Amino acid sequence: SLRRGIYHIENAGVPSAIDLKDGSSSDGTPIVGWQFTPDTINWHQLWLAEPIPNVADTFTLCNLFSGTYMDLYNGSSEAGTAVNGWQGTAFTTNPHQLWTIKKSSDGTSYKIQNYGSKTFVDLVNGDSSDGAKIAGWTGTWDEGNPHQKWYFNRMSVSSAEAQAAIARNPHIHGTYRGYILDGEYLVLPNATFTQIWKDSGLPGSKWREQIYDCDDFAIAMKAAVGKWGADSWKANGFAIFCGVMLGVNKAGDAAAAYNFTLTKDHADIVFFEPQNGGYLNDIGYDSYMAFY
Amino acid sequence: SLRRGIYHIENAGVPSAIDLKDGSSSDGTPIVGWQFTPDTINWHQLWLAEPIPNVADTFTLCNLFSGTYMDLYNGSSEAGTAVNGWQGTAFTTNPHQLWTIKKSSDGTSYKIQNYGSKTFVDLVNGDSSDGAKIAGWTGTWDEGNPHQKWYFNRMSVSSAEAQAAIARNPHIHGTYRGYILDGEYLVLPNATFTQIWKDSGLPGSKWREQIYDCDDFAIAMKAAVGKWGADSWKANGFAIFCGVMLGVNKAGDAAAAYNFTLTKDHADIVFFEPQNGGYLNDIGYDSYMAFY
Amino acid sequence: PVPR
Amino acid sequence: PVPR
Ligand SMILES: C[C@@H]1O[C@@H](O[C@@H]2[C@@H](O[C@H]3O[C@H](CO)[C@H](O)[C@H](O)[C@H]3O)[C@@H](O)[C@@H](CO)O[C@@H]2O)[C@@H](O)[C@H](O)[C@@H]1O
Ligand SMILES: C[C@@H]1O[C@@H](O[C@@H]2[C@@H](O[C@H]3O[C@H](CO)[C@H](O)[C@H](O)[C@H]3O)[C@@H](O)[C@@H](CO)O[C@@H]2O)[C@@H](O)[C@H](O)[C@@H]1O
Ligand SMILES: C[C@@H]1O[C@@H](O[C@@H]2[C@@H](O[C@H]3O[C@H](CO)[C@H](O)[C@H](O)[C@H]3O)[C@@H](O)[C@@H](CO)O[C@H]2O)[C@@H](O)[C@H](O)[C@@H]1O
Ligand SMILES: C[C@@H]1O[C@@H](O[C@@H]2[C@@H](O[C@H]3O[C@H](CO)[C@H](O)[C@H](O)[C@H]3O)[C@@H](O)[C@@H](CO)O[C@H]2O)[C@@H](O)[C@H](O)[C@@H]1O
Ligand SMILES: OC[C@H]1O[C@H](O[C@@H]2[C@@H](O)[C@@H](O)O[C@H](CO)[C@@H]2O)[C@H](O)[C@@H](O)[C@H]1O
Ligand SMILES: OC[C@H]1O[C@H](O[C@@H]2[C@@H](O)[C@@H](O)O[C@H](CO)[C@@H]2O)[C@H](O)[C@@H](O)[C@H]1O
Ligand SMILES: [Ca+2]
Ligand SMILES: [Ca+2]
Ligand SMILES: [Ca+2]
Ligand SMILES: [Ca+2]
Ligand SMILES: [Cl-]
Ligand SMILES: [Cl-]
Ligand code: NA
Ligand code: NA
Ligand code: NA
Ligand code: NA
């Protein structure tokens, strides 16, 4: 089954992602195919998939930027029916906004069926153009037609996935304790993490004994990413991935605070030194505490 | 012995505190007697006492606001010698900036002797006027003269004192773990804590599931107090007291994040709800984790 | 639980 | 120790 999470949804036939045109929150804003840049935040192209309780493999798809939902215009089963952003809620019973998402015959891509109409999300004519129509179209679950096949590129981790990434790290102290704060996290490219740091004012902060030392830099970076999350996205039900760790050196006679993020593959953590903005696989400390 | 810490130093004879005039960092800025408001931050009247290793009961006194040190002008033993703020360092060997501080004959107030001159800090003529001269003056350790007697009103806690205040609280979960980040903390009046909250932008922040929920408010309040500390004070070697706690309700089925501060007497904690700015003796959660 |  |  598709898991709850944030997805970048990429056509199987051509390199176009499902894009809410101009990120607009207006009802009836067209959802279109659009090119994308890997290892960036594709601002109009991220979708929060919320499973519907007691409806198998069925989800709402909320655009992270607009907070509006993928909507099949008037629930029509006609081929060519507009797919648009529309106001809604994460657990609506409105079938226009409910989507059954299951693996295609290829077994890696998915098809996206409207729960009401039983028609499929279709990049019309397989057009790779920026702004190409996406429509509800006649189809079947088993056919090869790449107009209706979609790679769900997972951009979020669950708290359980973050927990696993930390646990396989070789710089974790024996006494380590982790404190989880949220459920589902958008993983930032290091380019975006770095931009939040650059914009935070930390690069221009002086290290000062106790009054503005490593713990202040690390907590300030975590607050800066929290603020960025709320300010950047209108959807609810997810957090931005940014951890704080406390660590102790090998000699057990010095401690430090720092941040951490996750690799592109979501399998490992990477340490972030918030005084200088460096990324490190080894920061010179074993983590005894983390909150994220 | 006087312990390392931040003090408000109040004359025993008249309600004048030791004040660095206008908070000025200029060398030779006069230190004067000045009236004060209890349960406020008295901005020019806070002194960081740093013990000198291997010199008994001897300290530098750094003004928290200016970062400059109490200095006996040219180390003169003449009665009437100016006491001024002067550039220095926490562990100087300059005797002009070294002060032996021991209990007076009354046993609650202290006298302040210059280590070089062996003369005493003296509110000249016991004058209660705002801007009254403070001078080095002839004296003895045992005499009653209130011109030379000073109450050291302790405005900071050690991490060990904070740890004790948390431990005597009745809302601590059995699984509680605390993570200490600094050594010595300025305790804020609730009026100042509240002002930092009002100025943080949190009062005008909306609660949003995961993306800006209780953990975001609590970490944002802690960052706001950290920033305020560094921006407000030029001295180093202390932190501002502002904790974050995670707690679980009695039923064990809901958790929350919040802040905490300390009572005026430094003996107990008080919970701070960063969404609404309320102070509470019972926030409805037992703390399982704290960092401060 | 997880702080909400 | 204490994070410095
Ligand atoms: C190239 C083309 O691919 C297929 O046609 C698609 C359409 O396929 C879908 O709709 C048709 C009816 O119009 C039929 O129901 C098919 O099972 C279904 O997948 C559709 O994707 C549109 C819009 O993008 O484009 C093409 O017309 C295939 O059926 C055709 O024979 C032809 O090979
Ligand atoms: C009221 C007054 O109090 C005392 O005199 C103080 C001064 O006391 C200090 O200096 C004198 C010498 O001038 C002497 O060494 C004394 O032991 C010492 O405490 C001093 O505090 C000044 C400046 O504020 O004010 C008064 O002159 C006492 O000796 C006097 O007899 C008289 O009672
Ligand atoms: C917010 C905005 O994002 C970018 O423009 C979006 C655009 O972004 C996609 O397409 C561009 C090329 O047009 C790149 O491939 C990006 O990597 C994609 O993410 C689309 O989403 C369209 C239609 O919705 O809206 C534009 O605003 C970027 O080019 C802008 O500078 C700006 O950062
Ligand atoms: C920063 C400044 O603080 C206050 O003025 C200080 C003054 O503060 C003391 O005296 C005033 C009365 O003059 C009150 O009793 C305060 O409670 C004291 O803290 C002195 O420190 C003088 C001389 O150094 O400097 C003034 O700036 C306040 O009155 C100002 O509004 C302002 O907040
Ligand atoms: O128009 C406001 C509503 O938007 C969504 O429902 C509508 C639906 O009632 C119908 O008009 O068709 C449109 C276009 O397909 C939408 O799906 C919300 O689900 C409603 O609660 C309401 O806000
Ligand atoms: O003047 C700069 C210096 O300030 C302090 O020492 C002086 C001392 O050398 C003498 O000039 O007397 C004055 C007034 O009493 C000061 O105590 C610092 O301790 C020096 O390191 C230097 O910065
Ligand atoms: Ca949370
Ligand atoms: Ca600190
Ligand atoms: Ca520290
Ligand atoms: Ca959160
Ligand atoms: Cl087929
Ligand atoms: Cl006497
Ligand atoms: Na439209
Ligand atoms: Na379901
Ligand atoms: Na002077
Ligand atoms: Na000493």
Short mmCIF file of C-alpha atoms in Angstrom, two decimals, chain C:
data_model
loop_
_atom_site.label_atom_id
_atom_site.label_comp_id
_atom_site.label_asym_id
_atom_site.label_seq_id
_atom_site.Cartn_x
_atom_site.Cartn_y
_atom_site.Cartn_z
CA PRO C 1 2.69 9.77 23.16
CA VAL C 2 4.26 12.29 20.66
CA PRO C 3 3.95 16.00 21.78
CA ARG C 4 0.80 17.41 19.98
#
